[PDB]
Amino acid sequence: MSMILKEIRMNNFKSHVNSRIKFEKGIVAIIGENGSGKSSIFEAVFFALFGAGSNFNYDTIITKGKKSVYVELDFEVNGNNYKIIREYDSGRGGAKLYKNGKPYATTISAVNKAVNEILGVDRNMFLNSIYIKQGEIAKFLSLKPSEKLETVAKLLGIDEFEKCYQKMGEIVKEYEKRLERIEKEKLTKFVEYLDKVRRIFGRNGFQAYLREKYVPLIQKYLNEAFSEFDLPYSFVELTKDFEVRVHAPNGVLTIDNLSGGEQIAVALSLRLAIANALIGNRVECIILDEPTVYLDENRRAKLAEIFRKVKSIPQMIIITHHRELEDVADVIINVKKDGNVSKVKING
Amino acid sequence: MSMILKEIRMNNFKSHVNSRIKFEKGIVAIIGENGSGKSSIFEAVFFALFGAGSNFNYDTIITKGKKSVYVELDFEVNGNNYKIIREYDSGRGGAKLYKNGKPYATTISAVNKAVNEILGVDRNMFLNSIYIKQGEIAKFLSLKPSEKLETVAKLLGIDEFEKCYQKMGEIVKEYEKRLERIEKEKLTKFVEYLDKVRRIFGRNGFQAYLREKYVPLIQKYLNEAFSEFDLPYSFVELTKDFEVRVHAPNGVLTIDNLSGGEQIAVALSLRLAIANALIGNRVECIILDEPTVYLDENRRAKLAEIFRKVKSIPQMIIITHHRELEDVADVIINVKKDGNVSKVKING
Ligand SMILES: Nc1ncnc2c1ncn2[C@@H]1O[C@H](COP(=O)(O)OP(=O)(O)O)[C@@H](O)[C@H]1O
Ligand SMILES: Nc1ncnc2c1ncn2[C@@H]1O[C@H](COP(=O)(O)OP(=O)(O)O)[C@@H](O)[C@H]1O
Ligand SMILES: [Mg+2]
Ligand SMILES: [Mg+2]
Ligand SMILES: [Mg+2]
Ligand SMILES: [Mg+2]
């Protein structure tokens, strides 16, 4: 479900022609001027995990200099130590996966089947459960009440149209028109369980469901976040429409009714509660990219002190170009670009 | 979704060596001494609709005399006229289906695929949405509060374990181990939509869902039934656990808190509301088999007068051996067994 990033190592990956980075538990701050190669680090981490896509343009990741790339990630998931190695050289691609120090998967395909079964989530759901994009917090606070519920709906992925069963129940149907031309009955038994299923959703019931699965969860965590962040509100409600209702002393309040500082806390609390909800577990690692961008000096300070109260999450990686945030991290990874080649250094 | 039975015709079907029966809209009473061949009529109707099962013992339906059976059903579904013909003679079976007077399906298999797509439900769900077994009402009223919710859960079919995807996502997986031995990528695209789906239920969320889909529905109809049956209660609640709460003047009441007569009304109301819920539409036809069995003279009378108030359902077939119920029907189909052969006659 949720992992711990241990060590990434890249070769000819975009700006990083040769970089090795070790991550620690606690708060990790990847600090470096804009364009220095920070986001590529995690680009490499994600590429290591799900490799290239179908018909993927390998020029995007390979440092323009040559035609060869190699990334090695050491992560741990639910008590196990994994080492994923993904590489590509001149049209030749490969992938290997190790579990507790022994080979587990040796082929690009088997490595994927294994990775997918280790996380228990797909590429996108996993990405939303661990990576918080630049400006999310500021943008959330900018949206109008009705838009806030919108973004929550998105993060959860409510856009689901199981019409795929069309091709599904059919391509796996005709398979029997070749069984009727003078045992294989099982192939019917499941074509039914396909209808019995597609027959209970209708394309519009799948949403009514998700609101049932997530909302409960999100509200649970949102409340825990509140205690961790010391917000003065015993109960936080989350309507089935994703509206945040803070039960204050004199009556329910909406994020918009709160002070700048408290709004930051709630927004962070919500985005975290959602990440936990996507994986149905308390996240082990969360990566925030330039989370204080678009925030005035006041709200930056607030988030800074809130970061300091984050102890419920084992590993929190904050990427920034603001060096003041250095006073919040337990570890500091400086990144400097040297005329096209990134350099990483763990000091400060 | 829901049909109207027009005409059934059987040949060598159990007790009915040769019987032809026409049904009408309104209340139809199939009256006849125990063992006279009433339930076979509808056995034939159901057999006509879904034919024999896989490796089905044709001695059960074929009149013991010989080895040949033939059933022809004329029903209408959602504005269309259908004629289904199912037959079997000496190991040779066949099936034909006509829509609005023209051939539609000519092979046992194509006839099934067509029938299933016309009803929009499987054999069992359809059977619970149209056939109310003997003693259901009396038994329901006999059960203990906690058992009542139990039976509701059953009728809805909450027993669902999508673990079938095991064989599913796998038998349709290895299909690619034969694609990796030096386009067919689509076969992956849907193996994912299979996980993305099986990955959101977990075998225990599918129930939390059904309660969301049905309960709302059942409560809606239960209330309509109340008005049709003239019950003195503006609102009837149906908890997410399937408990019936009658909002009377002095406080909520449970079926058990009501008078014998009112309990019959509620039970009938509930079993009807469920049938509508299974097909997500107001039933067109409902068949009650010996619904007054196990009911004392009082409660029989009550149900009798309630039957008379049933106008919301286009066709209601009541099978019984009690001739007094004849005073409730718009049409009467007498059934007499003549030493092993049933005889049907529409008089009285
Ligand atoms: N394939 C590549 N080869 C060499 N350099 C690349 C390649 N792709 C991107 N870059 C360089 O990476 C730089 C960006 O690093 P950057 O992503 O801005 O780190 P951060 O996100 O922390 O600011 C760009 O300026 C670009 O020139
Ligand atoms: N294959 C068969 N051939 C001839 N008679 C049969 C066959 N199967 C069942 N029967 C007869 O049908 C009779 C039952 O008709 P029945 O179902 O009791 O009508 P109802 O249900 O309205 O009482 C049984 O007594 C049995 O002898
Ligand atoms: Mg960046
Ligand atoms: Mg920042
Ligand atoms: Mg009977
Ligand atoms: Mg009766």
Beta partners for residue A77, in sequence order? A3, A80
* Ligand 2 near B34 CB (within 6 A): yes
Query: In angstroms, what CA-CA distances link A237 with A9, A188, A252, B226, B253?
Result: 43, 46, 9, 35, 31
- Residue B139: phi and psi, rounded to 5, are -65, -40
Number of H helices, E strands in chain B: 10, 15
Resolution of the coordinates, Å: 2.8
Are B240 and B211 contacting, i.e. CB atoms less than 8 angstroms apart? yes
Q: Which residue in this structure is represented by tokens 């929190």? A: A316
Q: Which ligand is nearest to the CA of A337?
A: 1
Cα pseudo-dihedral A32, A36, A42, A45, rounded to 10: -130
Chain A and chain B share a number of CB contacts under 8 A equal to 63
Q: How many domains does chain A have?
A: 1
- Three-state SS at B70: strand
Q: Is B337 exposed, middle or buried (0-12, 13-18, 19+ CB in 10 A)?
A: middle
Q: State the distance from the centre of ligand 1 to the C-alpha of A80, rounded, in angstroms.
A: 32
Residue B90: count other Cβ atoms within 10 Å of its Cβ. 9
**What would the two tokens of residue A33 be?**
């001027």
- Three-state SS at B292: coil
- Domain span at residue A250 reads 1-348
Q: Is B233 exposed, middle or buried (0-12, 13-18, 19+ CB in 10 A)?
A: middle
Gaps in chain A (C–N > 2.5 Å) come after which residues? 182
> CATH number, domain at B173?
3.40.50.300
Which residue from B125, B173, B304, B153 is spatially nearest to B241, judged by alpha carbons?
Answer: B153
What's the rounded Cα separation, in Å, for the pair A62 and A64? 6
**What would the two tokens of residue B113 be?**
């695929």
Q: Of B10, B14, B41, B293, which is best to mutate to test ligand 2, by the most ligand atoms within 8 angstroms of its C-beta?
A: B14
CB contact under 8 A, A120 and B164: no
Q: Is B254 annotated as a binding residue?
A: no
For B54, the closest of A116, A121, A185 (CB atoms) is A185
What's the rounded Cα separation, in Å, for the pair A317 and A45? 13
Distance from CA of A102 to the nearest CA of B (A): 23
**What would the two tokens of residue A36 be?**
């220095």
Are A247 and A237 contacting, i.e. CB atoms less than 8 angstroms apart? yes
**Cβ contacts of B93 on chain A, cutoff 8 Å:** none
Residue B35: count other Cβ atoms within 10 Å of its Cβ. 11
Are B268 and B305 contacting, i.e. CB atoms less than 8 angstroms apart? no
Query: In angstroms, what CA-CA distances link B282 with A333, B2, B3?
Result: 66, 8, 11
Q: Where are the alpha helices (DSSP H) in B13-107?
A: 38-50
Query: In angstroms, what CA-CA distances link B21 with B7, B8, B42, B51?
Result: 6, 5, 11, 19
What's the rounded Cα separation, in Å, for the pair B31 and B289? 11
Query: Which residue in B118, B161, B197 has the most chain A C-beta atoms within 10 A of its own C-beta, making it the best mutation to test that interface?
Result: B197
Structure determination method: X-ray
DSSP per-residue codes, B168-232: HHHHTTGGGTTSS---TTHHHHHHHHHHHHHHHHTTTHHHHHHHHHHHHHHHHHHHHHHHHTT-S
What's the rounded Cα separation, in Å, for the pair A214 and A226? 18
Which residue from A258, A266, A257, A255 is spatially nearest to A229, judged by alpha carbons?
Answer: A266
Distance from CA of A206 to the nearest CA of B (A): 9
**What would the two tokens of residue B5 be?**
């039975």
CB contact under 8 A, A196 and B107: no
